[PDB]
Amino acid sequence: MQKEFRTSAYHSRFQTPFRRRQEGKTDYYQRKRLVTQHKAKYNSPKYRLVVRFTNKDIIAQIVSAHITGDVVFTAAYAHELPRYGIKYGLTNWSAAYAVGLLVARRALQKLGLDETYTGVEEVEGEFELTEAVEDGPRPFKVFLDIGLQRTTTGARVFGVLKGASDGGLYVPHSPNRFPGWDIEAEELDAELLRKYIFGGHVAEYMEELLDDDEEKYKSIFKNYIEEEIESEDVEEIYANAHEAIRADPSFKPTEKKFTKEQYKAESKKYRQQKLTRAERQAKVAKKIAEFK
Amino acid sequence: SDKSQNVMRELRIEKLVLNICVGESGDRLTRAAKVLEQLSGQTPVQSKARYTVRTFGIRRNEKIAVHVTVRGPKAEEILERGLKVKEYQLRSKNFSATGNFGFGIDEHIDLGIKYDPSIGIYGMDFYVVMGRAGARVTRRKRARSTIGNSHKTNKEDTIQWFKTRYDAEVLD
Amino acid sequence: GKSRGYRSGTRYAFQRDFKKHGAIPLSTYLKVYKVGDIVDIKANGSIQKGMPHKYYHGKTGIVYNVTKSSVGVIINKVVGNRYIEKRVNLRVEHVKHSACRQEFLNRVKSNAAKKREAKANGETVYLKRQAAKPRGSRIISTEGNIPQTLAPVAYETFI
Amino acid sequence: VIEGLRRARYKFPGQQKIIISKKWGFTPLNRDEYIAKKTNGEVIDDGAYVKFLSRKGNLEANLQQFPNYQYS
RNA sequence: GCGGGGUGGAGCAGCCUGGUAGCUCGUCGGGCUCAUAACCCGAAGGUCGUCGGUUCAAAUCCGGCCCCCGCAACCA
RNA sequence: GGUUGCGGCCAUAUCUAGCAGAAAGCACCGUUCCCCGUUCGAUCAACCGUAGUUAAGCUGCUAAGAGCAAUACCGAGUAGUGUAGUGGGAGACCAUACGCGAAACUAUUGUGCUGCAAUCU
RNA sequence: CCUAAGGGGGACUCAUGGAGAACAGAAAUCUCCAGUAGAACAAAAGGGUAAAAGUCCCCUUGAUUUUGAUUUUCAGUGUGAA
RNA sequence: GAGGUAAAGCGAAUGAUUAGAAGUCUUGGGCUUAACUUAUUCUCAAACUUUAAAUAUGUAAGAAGUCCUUGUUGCUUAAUUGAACGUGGACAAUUGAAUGAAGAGCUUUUAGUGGGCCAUUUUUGGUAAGCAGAACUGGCGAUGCGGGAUGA
């Protein structure tokens, strides 16, 4: 009774979206506004903090855009945190702060801005932008890129923001999306934010769930029990991690159990082959013959 | 593994939506909102008319109906009370092609709601939405996609699941 | 009456190409323009700001000014018995580098390289381009290529 | 038919010709080509017109459509 | 080249300014008279010429068509 | 070579129907004290990586597949067109000389390439 | 003609069709699926636009101040507009 | 580089349009007239279009250029990054296609004119017109001369 919609004209006149738009990964509106540079600032690139959250990892890459593709300046991953003393909760707000701090420190170390622009060592949770030093280089300026993730107050992307800003990068931002902002009274509750930086909310959950349902605590916090880390022992974990990151932020790759040749050799055993023309023709001819 | 017996293909209720389309506003729509708020334990939301029909005594952007969506244990409890009121009696017509179904109740007081002359009697509509694990891929913001054909729900499998789990009859 | 508005007669010139609608690919915004570059003007119908007039659509000029989001291009326009220098502000979506210039710079580089080679080698090289000359003499074999005779064919109808 | 078209010519302005076509009916094939297609089972009736075999597309559908086709 | 109209059965309003179709006569039911007329008590009847558009909403505003009525068509 | 994050060009990348996927990654997946958002913890927010699964997403393979792309003794030097004649023809129009030159149609082939960074049985 | 129908941000996806749900039927409301825009964007027509330029929500007044450069119409005068 | 006219196309979008065939009756009058769907079929568009010429059209082919080193700045960069203009050094007649060039450039001042008309091609209104109106070019007007008998 109704027309068959999937016609060959519908497919012929269909304009496919950009490949990364149809994978639902790039917002090109936001990307245009982020990347485009003042034309009187001729070849000086704009820099982005890409912050991406998978189910098990946190990615922080400092990226500048080019015609043939984006170029990574430095990158930091949450799976590097076991080297700095954080083993569990690698998608926390606190791990997010640690990753931001790590990428900021690695960037400043690679750029030579270590002695100048140390950052904020005595972390108290106060909104603070990195300020330039007189008669000297301006701070490394990057712009936060959260991609498709929604802006909410108390979101982990702004935890990475806070870490990168405290590492000494200059990242423009306002404090009204940190955990602790009061909309009715527009001030930042700095104690609550500093609690979030040092894992305090996780420790509060540990205390409450131990006092209420020790079986649920047993299941959820099993890793902490195995290491016998109690709720009082978390702030030191994150503080020691911050100290270790600030002491040595150099990148160390995970040593490869095989080289690229072995890796390519092993996976090719599980790639299917394309049929050649002779083979598809043979299949067609046999399918005609069998049909009688 | 490529198996249909996998634990991730098991059907279950996504949501129940309670619908009362009283055709107008006033004390009737307020009362219907109150009865939904009691039955669901959740505040319901009014729906406006999308345009004006003089046969229906209805006006564009004028409050008429009220609905609430319910999911979780509450959804299945209200579902089984509704099927009791139906006496576990549904038809193959009730089941949609995609794999949902619903029915109609002429009185909430049949479900076990204490009768109140302040509120009275209101007919109601039930509609459950089926689904499997991984329906998030069509709902999330990032990397949204579609569900593969063998994972999709459908009429026949939903009738099977209903007859099995609820031990009812689907009068074909 | 007659109508001579700003965008009159631009029904097709300002349309987007077939299956080329929508967002601008970011390579447009990453190109770098300098004063003295030669650029081609092409109005993009989806960017209503900083557009050329229809006269400058398809013209080529010199960049003389660079601002936040746009360049200033110098065009020569015939008005009666002389040209007038025109100055147009164009957002970078409507502008593109000209390719013939990059080819000419390639030739300048190659020519310097060749002259340096000849200098350091003790000979002289002629560096002016030349138009195609008449062909020289040649001898054609008939090995496997005996001349084949063709004749005009008779009229036929195919109705 | 030629005489019928001859009479109808007088109703028009200008000059017109009556041409006998080499082709089979209203089809775009010569008589011999239509016979050669017919004997290979590549044509079916579509009422007043016919349909021709395409060696492109879904093989099973094409083979159902023209059961008499003699693949060579 | 024009300007005015089309609305219960009839003649007429409501159009100007979009939200309920009004007046007189007429029709139908009952009463009064031996019956009629007058009179008395009650009821029906036009989607507004048609085809569309605009609008939340059209008899109402706009366009095309049909039927009606008339105005004007001069200087040689 | 697989995979992920950010991309460039933006269907050879799309679409339909089947099949297969080791490791890692990605993913689905559990939970609601906390920041946060909803009629609804479905989306969004946070927490656990702990209880489960390659079912789906994703990737690759298949189809005389649809679409797309490319090529050609394909049609066709055809349609059209610049220049010329005191060319032809009542005329509509047509040929010739010096030049340019399609689209449909027909046939065959192909079905992403790639930059940076990290990671992997 | 518009205090938004101007400015910024966010979230969402439109016309239409199919299959379902008491009253409820072709048109009331709810659910899912398909859907390149076949909708919408004050007003003519054309162009443009889909994680938007459309719809909804939040905050606003850049519809502000100072005078210069430029484009169209063009005499390269004015006015209007940009 | 730009273009959307000629041509072409419509079993490609929009709009127009001839004929059957097969399905769905669930959609309406009475074995089926009609709608609808599917694959076909004939014919079209100044205010339709995927494609798309020929002619016409924009720009470049260096000395005001290229290369090396490093000066200025209150602009710009995280920066010793750049931007613009430079100092000093290198490249000299093939100084970077052809053909031509009673030379190039600059200024003042003032006349007449501001009814046009014709021919080939393109083209609009009109039955058409030695009619009315546009485009490019060449002419007549302003021009005699040989030819078309005669004739802007």
Ligand SMILES: CN[C@@H]1[C@@H](O)[C@@H](O[C@@H]2[C@@H](O)[C@H](O[C@H]3O[C@H]([C@@H](C)O)[C@@H](O)[C@H](O)[C@H]3N)[C@@H](N)C[C@H]2N)OC[C@]1(C)O
């Ligand atoms: C290919 N297209 C052609 C186009 O080339 C042109 O053709 C002319 C033609 O019209 C000329 O012919 C024209 O002019 C001559 C005479 C006055 O010169 C007349 O005799 C003739 O009637 C007239 N048609 C002919 N002499 C040259 C072709 N190139 O004009 C006609 C056309 C069909 O458009």
